[PDB]
Amino acid sequence: GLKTAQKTLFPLRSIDDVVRLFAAELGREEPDLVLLSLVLGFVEHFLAVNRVIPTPEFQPSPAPDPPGGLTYFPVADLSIIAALYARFTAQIRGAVDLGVSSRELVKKVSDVIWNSLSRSYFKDRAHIQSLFSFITGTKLDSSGVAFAVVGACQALGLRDVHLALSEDHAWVVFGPNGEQTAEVTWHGEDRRGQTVNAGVAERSWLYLKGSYMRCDRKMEVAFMVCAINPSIDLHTDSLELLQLQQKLLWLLYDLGHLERYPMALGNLADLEELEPTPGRPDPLTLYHKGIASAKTYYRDEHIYPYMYLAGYHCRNRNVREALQAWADTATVIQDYNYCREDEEIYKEFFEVANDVIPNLLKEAASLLEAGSALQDPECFAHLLRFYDGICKWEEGSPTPVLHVGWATFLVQSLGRFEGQVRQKVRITFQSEKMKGMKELLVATKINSSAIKLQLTAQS
Ligand SMILES: CC1(CN2CCC3(CC2)CN(c2ncnnc2Oc2ccc(F)cc2CN2C(=O)C[C@H]4C[C@H]42)C3)CC1
Ligand SMILES: [K+]
């Protein structure tokens, strides 16, 4: 059952109503993860899953239809939300018979979630992150399973069970000092029931060498807020869900609950880039706050803080700063071993190397044709440092990184820098691969076939 202080806040008729419910919950020692996730999932379902109103091309009279379209909000009645809340609690409270939780108990709660899920659905669909999705559709995405287990543990009074988050995987931590770990969901087959010890030991990006986020209840709220998915379709985001996420992230920010959450700070900066809130820090300040957070709390072993920053510089045509931030990105990855479950960060580096940097340099070339970053040997050195970090990442790893297609874009990006610029650098490389082709990189003529042979040499 819901406390009367919670019920008095319903019905929710606006974004602001939702923000007040979140503000009220975050003022308590145990913000109700199940209540809050159900509200967000309900609002998201009727704003993005079933879009009620779609998202026109002057005259003396008023226009027949709203000339700028409509935004809307689906009213969240207490009756609807409490009914779903009671459904979840009856389910969880019934399936387990009851300040440190044991491994046997955590596995039990995890199994309750796991075995409730549909046997066959597309695990990568949008809008199956929330407990609304779990209750009304018996479907959860990978990290949504972990969040639901944490939520179920809170509903059972297991105050020591918490969400653990890397940059692409989720599990639970528990025990005396939060040092116990259990896999509860799949990634990518599954390691459910295992500890994460072997993943931390293999130095894969997926477990961040142990420098992963151990949430408290307030960061679990921040997680579900980051989990809002505004996509209506591939080309259309719900303005309302973006605005809801933005107001909620600022609320969490002001309470200090994004201090140890770098990707949440980058998320907020991305939103401020599109819709700046007057009186708030500008996006660059927030991007640098996320980098400072990763340095302070996670040993500077996170990748995305620098990709957030680089992307902003890229969209703002700050070529020098973008290239330096990508070089900084590769400098963090170079100390990891590329493992089989690391595909997500691989795809991000792939798009940077083979699309975003080529586009950035083509943009810069269009300015020069009409000082330019393409005439700056520091920019060229940053490009080489980016590839050096990727090569060192690959070096000695169980999985190859570079393939022939990467060499095509490298040759093209090298060519964007005139030989007279390239011949000015004096660089030392970490990777054997880059050491083995330093002279090819600074030669007046760029030997495409040799660079392809060298970049594709087997690790
Ligand atoms: C490349 C760039 C953009 N890019 C950066 C990376 C994200 C996508 C956008 C930001 N984001 C996250 N934000 C906050 N919390 N977790 C996140 O990721 C995880 C982490 C562990 C998991 F197990 C599952 C997910 C997926 N996930 C989310 O996306 C939100 C909540 C539901 C969780 C991943 C420029 C930087
Ligand atoms: K390596």
Short mmCIF file of C-alpha atoms in Angstrom, two decimals, residues 4-357:
data_model
loop_
_atom_site.label_atom_id
_atom_site.label_comp_id
_atom_site.label_asym_id
_atom_site.label_seq_id
_atom_site.Cartn_x
_atom_site.Cartn_y
_atom_site.Cartn_z
CA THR A 4 -1.05 8.82 2.33
CA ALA A 5 1.59 11.49 1.70
CA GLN A 6 2.23 9.83 -1.67
CA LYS A 7 -1.45 9.52 -2.61
CA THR A 8 -2.19 13.18 -1.84
CA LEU A 9 0.02 14.16 -4.80
CA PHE A 10 -2.28 12.46 -7.38
CA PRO A 11 -3.68 12.82 -9.99
CA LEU A 12 -0.59 13.81 -11.99
CA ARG A 13 -1.79 16.16 -14.72
CA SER A 14 1.49 17.73 -15.83
CA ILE A 15 5.25 17.34 -15.97
CA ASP A 16 5.44 19.61 -12.90
CA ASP A 17 3.15 17.24 -11.00
CA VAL A 18 5.59 14.43 -11.81
CA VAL A 19 8.55 16.55 -10.70
CA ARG A 20 6.86 17.22 -7.35
CA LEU A 21 6.24 13.51 -6.84
CA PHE A 22 9.93 12.93 -7.52
CA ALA A 23 10.93 15.81 -5.24
CA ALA A 24 8.79 14.39 -2.44
CA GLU A 25 10.19 10.87 -2.80
CA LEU A 26 13.81 12.05 -2.94
CA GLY A 27 13.32 13.78 0.40
CA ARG A 28 12.90 10.38 2.07
CA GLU A 29 15.53 7.82 3.00
CA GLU A 30 13.91 5.25 0.68
CA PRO A 31 12.44 6.87 -2.45
CA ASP A 32 9.88 4.39 -3.76
CA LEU A 33 11.61 2.98 -6.85
CA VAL A 34 8.56 0.95 -7.84
CA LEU A 35 6.15 3.88 -7.55
CA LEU A 36 8.41 6.25 -9.47
CA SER A 37 9.32 3.79 -12.24
CA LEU A 38 5.64 2.91 -12.75
CA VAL A 39 4.76 6.60 -13.13
CA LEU A 40 7.51 7.21 -15.69
CA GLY A 41 6.58 4.04 -17.59
CA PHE A 42 2.90 5.02 -17.63
CA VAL A 43 3.69 8.52 -18.90
CA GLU A 44 6.13 7.14 -21.46
CA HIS A 45 3.66 4.51 -22.69
CA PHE A 46 1.03 7.10 -23.57
CA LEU A 47 3.57 9.64 -24.88
CA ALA A 48 5.81 7.31 -26.92
CA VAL A 49 4.40 3.77 -27.20
CA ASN A 50 0.81 4.72 -28.06
CA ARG A 51 1.17 8.26 -29.38
CA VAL A 52 -2.38 9.58 -29.07
CA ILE A 53 -1.82 12.71 -31.19
CA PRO A 54 0.69 12.68 -34.08
CA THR A 55 3.50 15.22 -34.09
CA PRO A 56 0.74 21.68 -40.78
CA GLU A 57 2.31 23.49 -43.76
CA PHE A 58 -1.60 32.38 -43.18
CA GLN A 59 -5.15 33.73 -43.60
CA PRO A 60 -7.44 36.31 -41.93
CA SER A 61 -9.23 33.71 -39.73
CA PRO A 62 -7.62 31.28 -37.27
CA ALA A 63 -6.11 28.11 -38.68
CA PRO A 64 -8.41 25.05 -38.69
CA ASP A 65 -5.85 23.02 -36.74
CA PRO A 66 -3.21 24.15 -34.21
CA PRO A 67 -0.61 25.57 -36.59
CA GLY A 68 2.31 24.44 -34.43
CA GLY A 69 0.97 21.05 -33.44
CA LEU A 70 0.20 19.95 -29.90
CA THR A 71 2.03 18.69 -26.85
CA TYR A 72 0.04 16.68 -24.35
CA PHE A 73 0.16 14.86 -21.05
CA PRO A 74 -1.68 11.64 -20.12
CA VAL A 75 -3.38 12.07 -16.75
CA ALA A 76 -2.05 9.58 -14.18
CA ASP A 77 -4.89 8.78 -11.78
CA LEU A 78 -4.21 7.36 -8.35
CA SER A 79 -6.61 4.52 -9.15
CA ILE A 80 -4.59 3.43 -12.19
CA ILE A 81 -1.13 3.75 -10.63
CA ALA A 82 -2.08 2.25 -7.25
CA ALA A 83 -3.67 -0.75 -8.99
CA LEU A 84 -0.48 -1.50 -10.91
CA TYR A 85 1.60 -0.83 -7.79
CA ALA A 86 -0.54 -3.33 -5.86
CA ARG A 87 -0.11 -5.85 -8.68
CA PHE A 88 3.69 -5.68 -8.42
CA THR A 89 3.75 -5.82 -4.62
CA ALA A 90 1.29 -8.72 -4.36
CA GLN A 91 3.49 -10.56 -6.88
CA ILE A 92 6.81 -9.92 -5.14
CA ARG A 93 5.57 -10.18 -1.55
CA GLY A 94 3.93 -13.53 -2.32
CA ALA A 95 6.84 -15.26 -4.06
CA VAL A 96 9.41 -14.81 -1.25
CA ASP A 97 9.03 -15.59 2.46
CA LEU A 98 11.27 -13.42 4.62
CA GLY A 99 20.75 -6.07 7.89
CA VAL A 100 22.60 -8.16 5.31
CA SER A 101 20.97 -10.13 2.51
CA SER A 102 22.45 -13.51 1.61
CA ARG A 103 23.41 -14.71 -1.85
CA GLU A 104 20.64 -17.31 -1.68
CA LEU A 105 18.02 -14.60 -1.04
CA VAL A 106 19.27 -12.25 -3.76
CA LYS A 107 19.21 -15.09 -6.28
CA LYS A 108 15.64 -15.88 -5.15
CA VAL A 109 14.36 -12.37 -5.83
CA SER A 110 16.31 -12.23 -9.10
CA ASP A 111 14.71 -15.54 -10.14
CA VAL A 112 11.23 -14.16 -9.40
CA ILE A 113 11.79 -11.33 -11.89
CA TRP A 114 13.57 -13.55 -14.44
CA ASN A 115 10.92 -16.25 -14.47
CA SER A 116 8.05 -13.74 -14.79
CA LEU A 117 9.35 -12.44 -18.14
CA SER A 118 7.97 -13.45 -21.51
CA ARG A 119 9.97 -16.27 -23.06
CA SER A 120 10.31 -14.64 -26.49
CA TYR A 121 10.58 -10.91 -27.18
CA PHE A 122 13.05 -8.55 -28.77
CA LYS A 123 15.32 -7.59 -25.90
CA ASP A 124 16.51 -4.38 -27.60
CA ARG A 125 13.12 -2.71 -28.12
CA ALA A 126 12.45 0.76 -26.78
CA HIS A 127 10.11 1.43 -23.85
CA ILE A 128 10.56 -1.88 -22.03
CA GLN A 129 12.80 -0.42 -19.31
CA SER A 130 10.28 0.35 -16.56
CA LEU A 131 8.24 -1.54 -14.02
CA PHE A 132 5.23 -0.38 -16.03
CA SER A 133 6.60 -2.54 -18.85
CA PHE A 134 7.27 -5.40 -16.43
CA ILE A 135 3.76 -5.34 -14.89
CA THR A 136 1.66 -4.71 -17.98
CA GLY A 137 3.78 -6.45 -20.62
CA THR A 138 6.05 -8.94 -18.78
CA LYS A 139 9.03 -7.60 -20.78
CA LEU A 140 12.24 -5.89 -19.64
CA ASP A 141 15.43 -4.87 -21.42
CA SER A 142 18.73 -6.11 -20.02
CA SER A 143 19.45 -3.40 -17.48
CA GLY A 144 15.71 -3.10 -16.80
CA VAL A 145 15.86 -6.59 -15.30
CA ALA A 146 18.57 -5.46 -12.89
CA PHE A 147 16.59 -2.35 -11.94
CA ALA A 148 13.45 -4.44 -11.34
CA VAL A 149 15.37 -6.81 -9.07
CA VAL A 150 16.63 -3.84 -7.04
CA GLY A 151 13.09 -2.47 -6.91
CA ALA A 152 11.72 -5.82 -5.77
CA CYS A 153 14.41 -6.00 -3.07
CA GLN A 154 13.42 -2.57 -1.78
CA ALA A 155 9.77 -3.67 -1.72
CA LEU A 156 10.87 -6.64 0.42
CA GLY A 157 12.86 -4.41 2.79
CA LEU A 158 16.29 -5.60 1.61
CA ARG A 159 17.99 -2.26 2.12
CA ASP A 160 21.50 -3.58 1.34
CA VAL A 161 20.76 -4.60 -2.28
CA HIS A 162 21.75 -1.97 -4.83
CA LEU A 163 22.11 -1.45 -8.56
CA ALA A 164 25.63 -1.71 -9.99
CA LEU A 165 26.26 -0.07 -13.36
CA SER A 166 29.16 -0.08 -15.76
CA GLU A 167 28.86 1.95 -18.96
CA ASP A 168 26.91 -0.88 -20.68
CA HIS A 169 26.01 -3.60 -18.13
CA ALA A 170 24.09 -3.81 -14.85
CA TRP A 171 24.06 -6.18 -11.88
CA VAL A 172 23.49 -6.01 -8.13
CA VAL A 173 25.81 -5.45 -5.19
CA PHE A 174 24.87 -6.31 -1.60
CA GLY A 175 26.28 -7.49 1.70
CA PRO A 176 28.06 -5.86 4.67
CA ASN A 177 29.94 -3.22 2.68
CA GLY A 178 28.37 -3.68 -0.74
CA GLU A 179 31.24 -5.96 -1.74
CA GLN A 180 29.12 -8.96 -2.74
CA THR A 181 28.08 -9.14 -6.39
CA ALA A 182 25.60 -11.18 -8.40
CA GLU A 183 24.73 -11.22 -12.08
CA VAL A 184 20.94 -10.95 -12.50
CA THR A 185 20.48 -10.30 -16.22
CA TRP A 186 21.95 -11.18 -19.58
CA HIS A 187 24.33 -9.16 -21.67
CA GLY A 188 24.68 -8.96 -25.44
CA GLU A 189 23.25 -16.21 -22.97
CA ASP A 190 23.86 -15.14 -19.37
CA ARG A 191 26.14 -15.37 -16.33
CA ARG A 192 23.22 -15.11 -13.89
CA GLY A 193 24.15 -16.10 -10.34
CA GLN A 194 27.87 -15.59 -10.92
CA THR A 195 29.97 -12.87 -9.34
CA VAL A 196 31.55 -10.19 -11.54
CA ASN A 197 35.03 -11.11 -10.24
CA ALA A 198 36.11 -12.77 -13.49
CA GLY A 199 34.87 -9.85 -15.59
CA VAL A 200 36.74 -7.35 -13.42
CA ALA A 201 39.82 -9.58 -13.70
CA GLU A 202 39.78 -9.89 -17.49
CA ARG A 203 40.12 -6.06 -17.81
CA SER A 204 37.16 -5.80 -20.17
CA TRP A 205 35.46 -2.45 -20.65
CA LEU A 206 32.20 -4.14 -19.67
CA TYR A 207 33.26 -4.29 -15.99
CA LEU A 208 35.50 -1.17 -16.05
CA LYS A 209 38.30 -2.99 -14.17
CA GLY A 210 36.10 -2.60 -11.06
CA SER A 211 35.61 1.17 -11.45
CA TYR A 212 31.86 0.81 -11.91
CA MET A 213 29.00 2.71 -10.28
CA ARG A 214 27.63 1.39 -6.96
CA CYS A 215 24.32 3.23 -6.66
CA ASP A 216 22.57 4.32 -3.54
CA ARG A 217 18.78 4.70 -3.67
CA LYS A 218 19.11 8.26 -4.96
CA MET A 219 21.30 7.24 -7.87
CA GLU A 220 18.79 4.47 -8.64
CA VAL A 221 16.25 7.28 -9.12
CA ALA A 222 18.74 9.07 -11.37
CA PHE A 223 19.10 5.81 -13.32
CA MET A 224 15.38 5.48 -14.04
CA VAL A 225 15.39 9.15 -15.11
CA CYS A 226 18.25 8.54 -17.55
CA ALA A 227 16.23 5.47 -18.62
CA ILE A 228 13.42 7.66 -19.99
CA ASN A 229 13.28 6.94 -23.73
CA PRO A 230 11.66 9.81 -25.68
CA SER A 231 11.78 8.04 -29.06
CA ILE A 232 8.40 7.81 -30.73
CA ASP A 233 10.03 6.45 -33.89
CA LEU A 234 13.52 6.54 -35.38
CA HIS A 235 13.13 10.16 -36.53
CA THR A 236 10.87 11.66 -33.83
CA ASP A 237 11.43 12.30 -30.13
CA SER A 238 8.62 13.24 -27.77
CA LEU A 239 9.16 16.85 -26.70
CA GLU A 240 7.26 16.11 -23.48
CA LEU A 241 9.50 13.21 -22.43
CA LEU A 242 12.65 15.23 -23.20
CA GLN A 243 11.29 18.09 -21.08
CA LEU A 244 10.37 15.68 -18.27
CA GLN A 245 13.83 14.09 -18.26
CA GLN A 246 15.46 17.54 -18.28
CA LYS A 247 13.47 18.92 -15.33
CA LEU A 248 14.00 15.68 -13.38
CA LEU A 249 17.77 15.64 -14.00
CA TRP A 250 18.05 19.23 -12.78
CA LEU A 251 16.12 18.28 -9.64
CA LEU A 252 18.55 15.41 -9.02
CA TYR A 253 21.48 17.70 -9.87
CA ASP A 254 20.44 20.32 -7.31
CA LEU A 255 20.17 17.63 -4.62
CA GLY A 256 23.70 16.41 -5.34
CA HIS A 257 22.63 13.04 -6.75
CA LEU A 258 24.49 13.34 -10.08
CA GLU A 259 27.86 13.99 -8.38
CA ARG A 260 29.00 10.36 -8.90
CA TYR A 261 27.05 9.78 -12.14
CA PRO A 262 29.09 10.91 -15.18
CA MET A 263 26.68 9.71 -17.92
CA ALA A 264 23.77 11.45 -16.21
CA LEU A 265 25.78 14.71 -16.30
CA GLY A 266 26.49 14.18 -20.01
CA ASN A 267 22.80 13.44 -20.60
CA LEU A 268 21.90 16.71 -18.90
CA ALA A 269 24.48 18.62 -20.94
CA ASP A 270 23.10 17.09 -24.16
CA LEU A 271 19.61 18.28 -23.20
CA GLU A 272 20.88 21.78 -22.38
CA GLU A 273 22.57 21.91 -25.79
CA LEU A 274 19.18 21.50 -27.48
CA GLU A 275 17.02 23.41 -24.95
CA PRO A 276 19.12 25.70 -22.74
CA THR A 277 17.52 26.47 -19.38
CA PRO A 278 18.06 30.15 -18.44
CA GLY A 279 20.14 30.60 -15.30
CA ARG A 280 21.78 27.13 -15.64
CA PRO A 281 25.43 26.26 -16.42
CA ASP A 282 26.13 25.90 -20.13
CA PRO A 283 26.71 22.45 -21.67
CA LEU A 284 30.53 22.61 -21.64
CA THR A 285 30.51 23.18 -17.88
CA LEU A 286 28.37 20.07 -17.45
CA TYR A 287 30.49 17.93 -19.80
CA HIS A 288 33.58 18.91 -17.81
CA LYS A 289 31.71 18.09 -14.60
CA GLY A 290 31.09 14.56 -15.87
CA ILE A 291 34.77 14.16 -16.73
CA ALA A 292 35.73 15.48 -13.29
CA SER A 293 33.28 13.00 -11.75
CA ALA A 294 34.82 10.08 -13.65
CA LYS A 295 38.31 11.19 -12.59
CA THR A 296 37.28 11.73 -8.98
CA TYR A 297 35.21 8.63 -8.28
CA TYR A 298 36.11 6.09 -10.99
CA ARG A 299 39.88 6.38 -11.42
CA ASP A 300 39.39 8.12 -14.80
CA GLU A 301 38.57 4.71 -16.29
CA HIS A 302 35.28 5.66 -18.01
CA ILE A 303 35.07 6.16 -21.79
CA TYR A 304 31.81 8.06 -22.34
CA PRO A 305 32.72 11.29 -20.40
CA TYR A 306 35.18 12.18 -23.20
CA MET A 307 32.81 11.06 -25.98
CA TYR A 308 30.10 13.38 -24.64
CA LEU A 309 32.56 16.27 -24.72
CA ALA A 310 34.02 15.38 -28.12
CA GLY A 311 30.56 15.15 -29.68
CA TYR A 312 29.58 18.61 -28.48
CA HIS A 313 32.80 20.08 -29.86
CA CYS A 314 32.14 18.26 -33.13
CA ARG A 315 28.60 19.61 -33.58
CA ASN A 316 29.97 23.07 -32.70
CA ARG A 317 32.84 22.87 -35.26
CA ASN A 318 35.54 23.12 -32.58
CA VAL A 319 37.87 20.84 -34.53
CA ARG A 320 40.96 21.12 -32.30
CA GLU A 321 38.94 20.47 -29.14
CA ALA A 322 36.98 17.58 -30.67
CA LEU A 323 40.15 15.82 -31.84
CA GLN A 324 41.82 16.32 -28.46
CA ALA A 325 38.79 14.90 -26.64
CA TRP A 326 38.74 11.84 -28.92
CA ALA A 327 42.47 11.40 -28.36
CA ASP A 328 41.74 11.56 -24.62
CA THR A 329 39.03 8.93 -25.21
CA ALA A 330 41.47 6.53 -26.87
CA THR A 331 43.97 7.14 -24.06
CA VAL A 332 41.50 5.64 -21.56
CA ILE A 333 40.57 2.63 -23.71
CA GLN A 334 44.19 1.75 -24.48
CA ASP A 335 44.62 0.19 -21.01
CA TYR A 336 41.64 -2.18 -21.46
CA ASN A 337 41.56 -5.58 -23.14
CA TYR A 338 39.02 -5.79 -25.96
CA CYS A 339 36.77 -8.67 -24.95
CA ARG A 340 33.80 -10.34 -26.61
CA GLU A 341 31.10 -8.48 -24.64
CA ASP A 342 32.60 -5.03 -25.33
CA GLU A 343 30.83 -4.60 -28.69
CA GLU A 344 28.96 -1.40 -27.71
CA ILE A 345 32.07 0.70 -27.07
CA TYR A 346 33.59 -0.85 -30.22
CA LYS A 347 30.64 0.45 -32.26
CA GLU A 348 31.10 3.93 -30.80
CA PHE A 349 34.82 3.97 -31.67
CA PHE A 350 33.96 2.59 -35.11
CA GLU A 351 31.56 5.47 -35.81
CA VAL A 352 34.07 8.02 -34.52
CA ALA A 353 36.93 6.69 -36.64
CA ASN A 354 34.93 5.88 -39.75
CA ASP A 355 32.22 8.54 -39.85
CA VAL A 356 32.42 11.35 -37.30
CA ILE A 357 36.11 12.25 -37.69
#
